[PDB]
Amino acid sequence: AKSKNHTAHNQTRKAHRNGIKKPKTYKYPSLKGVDPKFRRNHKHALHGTAKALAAAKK
Amino acid sequence: AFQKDAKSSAYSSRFQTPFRRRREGKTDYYQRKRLVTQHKAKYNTPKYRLVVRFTNKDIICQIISSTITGDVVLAAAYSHELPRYGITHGLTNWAAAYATGLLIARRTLQKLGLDETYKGVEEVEGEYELTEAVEDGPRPFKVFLDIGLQRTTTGARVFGALKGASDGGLYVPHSENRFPGWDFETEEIDPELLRSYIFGGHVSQYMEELADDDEERFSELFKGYLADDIDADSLEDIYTSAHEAIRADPAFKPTEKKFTKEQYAAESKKYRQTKLSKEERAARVAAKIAALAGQQ
Amino acid sequence: ARRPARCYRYQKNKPYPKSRYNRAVPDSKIRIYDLGKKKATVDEFPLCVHLVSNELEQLSSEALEAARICANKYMTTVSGRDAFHLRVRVHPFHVLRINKMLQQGMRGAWGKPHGLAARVDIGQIIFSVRTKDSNKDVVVEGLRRARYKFPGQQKIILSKKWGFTNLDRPEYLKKREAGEVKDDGAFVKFLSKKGSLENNIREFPEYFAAQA
Amino acid sequence: QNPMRDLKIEKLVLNISVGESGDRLTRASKVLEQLSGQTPVQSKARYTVRTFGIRRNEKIAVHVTVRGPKAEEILERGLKVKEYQLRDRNFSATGNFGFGIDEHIDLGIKYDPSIGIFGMDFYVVMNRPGARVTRRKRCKGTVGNSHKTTKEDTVSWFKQKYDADVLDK
Amino acid sequence: GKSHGYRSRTRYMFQRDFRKHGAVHLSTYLKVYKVGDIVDIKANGSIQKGMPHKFYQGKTGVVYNVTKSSVGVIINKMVGNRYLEKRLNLRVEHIKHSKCRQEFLERVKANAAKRAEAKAQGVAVQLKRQPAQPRESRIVSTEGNVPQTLAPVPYETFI
RNA sequence: AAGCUCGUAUCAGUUUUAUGAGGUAAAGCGAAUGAUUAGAGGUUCCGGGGUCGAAAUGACCUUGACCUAUUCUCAAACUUUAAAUAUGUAAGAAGUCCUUGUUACUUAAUUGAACGUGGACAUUUGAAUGAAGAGCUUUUAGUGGGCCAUUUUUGGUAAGC
RNA sequence: GAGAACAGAAAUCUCCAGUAGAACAAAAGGGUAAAAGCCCCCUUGAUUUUGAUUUUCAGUGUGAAUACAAACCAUGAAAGU
């Protein structure tokens, strides 16, 4: 055998066809990984303020 | 210094100077880090250390927080304030530590608003406890003991500041085993030895064992307890009422001054040498170059 | 047993000297880099003529030796073995390798050290010589003779300076008859205008006249 | 002037360097016990030299450091056996000194064959007052030149008190 | 064999600094980071815990989380033809607030004060950033400044 | 190939502006490590010799080692310094600011932290240039021997290697 | 480097200088000085339960690590780790 071992040749050519797409941002990122203490409370700090905007809306 | 001494250009060039306050041996940073730094989830919640520093015969108790701009002092109570509370001698002693740490405890608790709440142990029998949690009401003021460079030894007198600051009502977490009366040989505290110490009963027990076995020394030391005639057995009630005075009025009367910064400025600026100009330097050198040449 | 000097002439590979990871390398064929009267004082020999490389190439030690020997061997037997000072101005720290020895599994070619060579720049000095201006032509032809031992082009140039110092003849004679130059071995030392004034004057007592 | 620069004797260190361990060692540190009155401290061999009969950590020598008037006592009692004659050597250029004596008995120890005889290294360390700057924990620092313990300066103190002799140049 | 370990190739990169070694000063710990703070990553070699990977060295990111010793930092890593979001767990000693932000804030705030002062004065606000423009006309005075005539210089040696 | 949701809303193998990271090129060795030519000057409970001797903790010449201040030359696996090209993030409505709900997390402390209600500001709403728009999904082909030029570059004396 | 009986180039004792020129099982490179090195004392977090992450990467597995949550602990006056 003895056939070529490796190269990056052409590889940016293929990469750029469909073009290195930007990360695609949103508002409201997911909390994945955020500390469980913060989150567990933050659940009630939200559930809590939803009742407060139900009663107050009447 | 010496000849085969005298560091080179290299050694200087490549030298790395420690911090000023490690170069002055005043600050152990490996401890300061672990004390001051705050849980990153508690954000700008300050970490509050109780700094206890003995000079030679004076005591400092400072509740301090920290900024990148430098640390900030809540309030301080030095031992040398103790005369206004009726202690005129032995201000460097364990029972004065206790006295000063209790003055610093009320003073801060005063200025904060927790003064009427959290009165600490008022009876002061020297039993081992720490100030508890008021139910339905603010948590006690939590402050941490900064021992400085003090060796931690059971019965050492930094922990007097502790006991008095705890008994003042501040929250200062701690254990017993550094309190005089902690038995090496058993898990026990004997708070009777600790109450005696709180009131100076180890110093008062000294005068007695002195007065009859040496009056030559007893002339030397306790000399102030003679000229003012406060004798050995009278000591415990000096302190016992000093706490009364303490919780009465923590408020920190500042010194009356007598003169002013401008005055103290001028009188001190009398004594400091002003820096020479470069023109002045070019003079002396050109003066030395005239001197040493021409057959000296 | 040596490969012709062609094979190693150009500077192809990264400088690879005797090293903690080399260790195996031979002895340089050149050893002694200063010849003639080498304690001679800075004012004894004003004149300086360099040998200058016109190429970016590699001189072998064994060439450096043969040119050193050659030039000196002449320069002494014309103007005398104290007449000059010959300073080889380049050193051979670059280790040349050789791969000594169809076939099969499996080649690997790394060389064992075959020799040493001095990497030279264009306009980098091979030889410096100092003598008295009286002795010029003898030195020049002496360098012109060692020239033939070196691959590729090199040139000889009368130095604008005073011997091996960093000063031109007039600017040197300035600091000389002013009190600023003191003898050290073959070289000199110079009066600092900065530093401790104390031993500044301990040295250079010749100074602190402010006259001839 | 010179009010607070004395020359105190910081400590005196008796040293018995005995090339083995076991019995003969304990007898050599039983010696130093009754001279100092303190219970003394033993030294382990750094490495194995095998021509000195020493193995690494074999507990070779013994010593004790003594401070206060208990020093001047033993210094004098040892300065006796020197016939109050020391040398220009015996003095470090850092301001201290020391000597040595064969026969520990040559200062009032009796003999007691159940113990035996040992020579001693006597070393006397000097400093002025205020040298705890270099010792204490907080704010440690080295003491300035004027106050440092020098050699020429300690000899001048060593001849003055004790009346004794420097002797070699 | 070839080698690629977690710190492979970090020799000089994680090297401490010159004369800057030894335990870190306190303000590094004194800083406060909350979520959505934009931080630089540079690893400090002396702190091995919570240390970033060599790749993210020099990469700026947004903190998504605040835990005891650490900010979680969220960084978009291109792999192949796309970017992937990666969530780093970094100790404060390697994190640095980024100044890339502040000049934009010190502009925004400037624009509000520029705008309100302008508008309540009147119209004519110019708050978009124009890039460097060509030079405007000018007359350079000859007066006591007379053109100096220079010439190319000959060949010399002075070796 | 199929389209699908939308339509100037975003979009960019580019510049600029602000702010990061980097340790190559160069440079350096009278800076650290390492290597290296040459002299000059100091030194001793003391490396070898020699001379005066009945011995020097002698006295001298000697040659080494050392030490200081100089000198020629160096590095892929050395370095204080440190480029060019390349490289991260930012340049607004998901912005900025005011008022003040929720919470079981946090603080001594409605202190914080996170999420909001309500409220002020939209002509240049916050650089340049461009845009046959932008976003999005499924599904499947061939391929998975490569070779060449210039520049960086490893092994090799070299090679159409 | 200057000192101390036997003691010698090397035993043990002392003071001075010493930015790390040492040590940290091993390869090398990083890192470390009131330590991360040396001595000491107390211990078993080399434990429990399940998720998130980083490297390699297909962003699979494996190895390795990082930062949390919920336990139960160890050390320390204490912050803490």
Add this chain to the structure above:
RNA sequence: GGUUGCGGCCAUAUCUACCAGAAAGCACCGUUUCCCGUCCGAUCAACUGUAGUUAAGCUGGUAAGAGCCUGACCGAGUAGUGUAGUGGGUGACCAUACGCGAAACUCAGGUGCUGCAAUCU
């Protein structure tokens, strides 16, 4: 202004040698009964602020000092380098065109700035 306690930045602060330091505060210093630690109250603990001293620590000043820091009509638009040509040269290598642009070095200026709280002729 001085000093202390806690600091931030961590040499313009460190290094060598000298000189000066009122006041206060530091300090060095006295003691060994008590908790406590050592072979050694040296260090560490404790009592006295009494008995003594600015000697040193500390702070300031001095020096064509060393080091460090800063700047640039320094080195130098040099080296290096992105880009171009069917430019030069047997080559090695080099000029030119449109851009970016060092380093040691040379000279010069400088030798801690400052946060909180207390205290002080």
